[PDB]
């Protein structure tokens, strides 16, 4: 009974502390910065072969190999330079919602409405791709997964919880709880000691991988957060939400720094990613168009050419050379 | 390691992908929704912590894949986007449970007005008709108490008299059907159609009902694809 008033008081105290630190804004500080100017990106490559709507893709750390999940039940691994399909992995469940590429390139993971996360070993001696392990224990669809290491993978689920898995044993090393809605996206900090997850409760949380508790919570969005991405230095992260606004948050000021939105934009944002330097913030929309935002000036620095359907995923190579966008039209397009 | 051998590998993967697209196009995907008290868990058995169960069957040598969604959280609004572009949704409701009948109505409303299901036709199974008949014939509990409009609703002359059952049974079941058809017609434009059916969970015809409704849905889709409309 008494504890709820304590919770409200602590919430107000946190709000007051955030206000105390809000004496300036990113726009006020970047007024004089030279604008990015108009950016044109040509579709250097169109990767064709998925049967159904693509739902996720990920880059190998080599910045050349590219995994891609489609809800036809396939993971395809692409050589982005030559457009050669390196692997086609048939999945036991066709309703894939996420995929990941191991930072070593040895493993590729996927998941979806089947609440299990399947780890695939790409480096088999038999020459085929075998399910290394199926991670089970999440109650509800699995929405995102990201490898910390060959032996550790972080997953988020409609279960409203994230979990860290010891792939060797297949057991949750730790489970992250506190979200009050479906967790829809997840991103690892570059140091891999922290990750952030956005949920349908219109909030984002910062999780300590080893401690197992959420150090911070961000609530600027008005609607479900569909996408989240760390700033390349790991001090800030962008979020994409159904409310058509992207937002930048700082882990140290513990509050929203900037909103990226336009009155002509009403579609929800499906994906977000920074460029290598962090000056560009790319976002995909239900409108069939990825918009490039000046991460500092908030200006709509450009717009990636049309997809034929909702842009579902995008990601920037680890070297920053190119942007890959997937969409429900079954094509990945590479922009540079 | 010549690049030409990698191109050969890519071409073999392309061949396999075409071989799989042939299977993908030649199957009809169906989403089986409905509350837990509905007979949907029983309807699947009459067809011939995991999160999804693909039932599979065929009628007249067309293959149906019916995906029952289980162990998912109650909030449908997110994972439902995956099922855009299914051929139909099969929505099952326990017609006899007047207490939860309004919740079934609200669930049907939310599915029908969904942003992403805007072009998906709903095959509506008004299930457990035998229990409805037994309820209305016993009279101990009456839909009158839950839906005041039933006190004045009267069976239309267009109603099918085939069963020859008690007139109260027909009146109650047709009022229940109208309760869903009203939502369908009010919100539904010409994009998608609702196909109500009175069914028992133990009923061999449900597969044929699904086949007929899917045939009508595919006919309606072709009518637009081929510019006839």
């Amino acid at each position: 009974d008494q504890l709820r008033q304590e919770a409200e008081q602590l919430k107000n105290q946190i709000r007051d502390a955030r206000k105390a630190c809000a004496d300036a804004t990113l726009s006020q500080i970047t007024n004089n910065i030279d604008p990015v100017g108009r950016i044109q990106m040509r579709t250097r490559r169109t990767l064709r072969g998925h049967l159904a709507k693509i739902y996720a893709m990920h880059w190998g750390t080599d910045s050349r190999l590219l995994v891609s999940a489609s809800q036809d039940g396939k993971l395809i691994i692409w050589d982005s330079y030559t457009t050669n399909k390196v692997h086609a992995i048939p999945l036991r469940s066709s309703w894939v919602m996420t995929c990941a590429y191991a930072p070593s390139g040895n493993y590729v993971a996927c998941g979806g409405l089947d609440n299990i996360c399947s780890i695939y070993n790409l480096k088999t001696r038999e020459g085929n791709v075998r399910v290394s392990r199926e991670l089970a224990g999440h109650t509800g669809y699995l929405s995102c997964c990201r490898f910390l290491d060959d032996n550790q993978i972080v997953t988020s689920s409609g279960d409203t919880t994230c979990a860290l898995w010891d792939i060797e044993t297949g057991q949750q090393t730790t489970t992250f709880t506190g979200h009050t809605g479906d967790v829809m996206s997840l991103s690892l900090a570059p140091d891999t000691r922290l990750f952030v997850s956005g949920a349908c409760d219109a909030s984002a949380k910062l999780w300590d991988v080893r401690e197992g508790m959420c150090r911070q919570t961000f609530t600027g969005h008005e609607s479900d957060i569909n996408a989240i991405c760390f700033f390349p230095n790991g001090n800030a992260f962008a979020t994409g939400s159904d409310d058509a606004t992207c937002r930048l948050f700082d882990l140290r000021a513990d509050q929203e720094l900037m909103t990226y939105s336009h009155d002509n934009i009403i579609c929800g944002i499906t994906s977000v990613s920074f460029s290598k330097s962090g000056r560009l913030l790319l976002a995909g929309y239900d409108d069939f168009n990825c918009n490039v935002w000046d991460a500092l000036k908030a200006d709509r620095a450009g717009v990636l050419a049309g997809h034929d359907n909702r842009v579902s995923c995008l990601g920037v190579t680890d070297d920053g050379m190119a942007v890959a966008t997937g969409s429900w039209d079954s094509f990945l397009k590479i922009w540079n | 390691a010549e690049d030409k051998a990698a191109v050969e590998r890519s071409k073999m993967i392309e061949k396999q992908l075409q071989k799989d697209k042939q299977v993908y196009r030649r199957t009809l995907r169906l989403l089986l929704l409905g509350a837990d008290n509905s007979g949907k868990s029983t309807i699947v058995k009459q067809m011939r912590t995991s999160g999804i169960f693909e039932t599979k069957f065929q009628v007249d040598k067309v293959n149906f894949h019916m995906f029952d969604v289980g162990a998912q959280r109650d909030e449908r609004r997110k994972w439902i986007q995956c099922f855009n572009d299914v051929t139909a949704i099969i929505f099952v409701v326990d017609s006899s449970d007047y207490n939860r009948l309004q919740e079934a109505l609200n669930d049907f409303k939310s599915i029908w007005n969904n942003r992403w299901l805007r072009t998906i036709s709903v095959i509506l199974f008004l299930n457990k008709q035998d229990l409805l008949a037994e309820k209305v014939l016993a009279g101990k509990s009456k839909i009158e108490d839950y839906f005041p409009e039933f006190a004045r609703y009267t069976t239309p002359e267009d109603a099918t008299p085939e069963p020859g059952e008690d007139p109260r049974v027909t009146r109650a079941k047709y009022f229940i059907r109208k309760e869903f058809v009203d939502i369908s017609t009010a919100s539904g434009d010409g994009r998608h159609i609702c196909y109500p059916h009175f069914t028992c969970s133990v009923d061999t015809e449900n597969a044929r009902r699904i086949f007929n409704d899917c045939k009508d849905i595919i006919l309606q889709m072709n009518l637009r694809e081929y510019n006839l409309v």
């Epitope: 038999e126 020459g127 | 590998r9």
Partner: single-chain antibody, 232 residues
Framework: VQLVESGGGLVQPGGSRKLSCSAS????????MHWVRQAPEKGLEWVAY????????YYADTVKGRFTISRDDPKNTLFLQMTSLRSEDTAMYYC??????????????WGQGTTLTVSSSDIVMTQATSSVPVTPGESVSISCRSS???????????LYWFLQRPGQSPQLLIY???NLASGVPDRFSGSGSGTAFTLTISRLEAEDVGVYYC?????????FGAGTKLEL
């Protein structure tokens, strides 16, 4: 994983013979396959290649027309059909798998081979040092050169290094100028300028004793070096 060649024996000149190579424990259908000849006490010699799905077939001019390579994917069996045997054809024939995609390691497994006894513009590979006396713990180096530069425009240097221990089939050591193969210890290292290449063993051990063969894969026919025999 195993490859087991069968057939061979003694056949009179001008005769015909069929070699069989039974594959088990790996996805045979997805691998390209090679036949590699080794005349008695001589170096390796690529015979024929058949790609996965039989899309591509290549032969060395020494055997073109005379030999025919075929595979039966459902039976995980590879065949070499030899119609007109010669004295030149006497050799141990190895069955070798090769899977080609970005970052693959072709030639990673060799069968134990079968012995057959009988009563022009391609790239020349050379290993001037036929043998090297060496002792354990030494930082050995084995040199190689090619008549044509193996560094392709795409950045790959298509040089391979194989170790053949006495009485054993060749083992892949390095599957691209620098790329150390799987199951090979860190002792071995590869480097080169795109026309001259070196294999380094940091601290030789008794198990490293054998003949080291370089091979080019820039274009067919695949040509091996004469080999360098380490001994102690």
């Amino acid at each position: 994983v195993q490859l087991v060649e069968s057939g061979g024996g003694l056949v009179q000149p001008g005769g015909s013979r069929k070699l069989s190579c039974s594959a088990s424990g790996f996805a045979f259908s997805s691998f390209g396959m090679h036949w590699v000849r080794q005349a008695p006490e001589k170096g390796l010699e690529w015979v024929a290649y058949i790609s996965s799905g039989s899309g591509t077939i290549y032969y060395a001019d020494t055997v073109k027309g005379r030999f025919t390579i075929s595979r039966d994917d459902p039976k995980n069996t590879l065949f070499l059909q030899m119609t007109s045997l010669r004295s030149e054809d006497t050799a141990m024939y190895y069955c070798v798998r090769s899977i080609y995609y970005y970052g693959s390691s072709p030639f990673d497994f060799w069968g134990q081979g079968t012995t057959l006894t009988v009563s022009s513009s391609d790239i020349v590979m050379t290993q001037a040092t036929s043998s090297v006396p060496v002792t354990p713990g030494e930082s050995v180096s084995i040199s190689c050169r090619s008549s044509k530069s193996l560094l392709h425009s795409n950045g790959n240097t298509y040089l391979y290094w194989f170790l053949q221990r006495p009485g054993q089939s060749p083992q892949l050591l390095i599957y691209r100028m620098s790329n150390l193969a799987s199951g090979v210890p860190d002792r071995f290292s590869g480097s080169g300028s795109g026309t001259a290449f070196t294999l380094t063993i940091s601290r030789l051990e008794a198990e490293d004793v054998g003949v080291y063969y370089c091979m080019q894969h820039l274009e067919y026919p695949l040509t091996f070096g004469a080999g360098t025999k380490l001994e102690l």
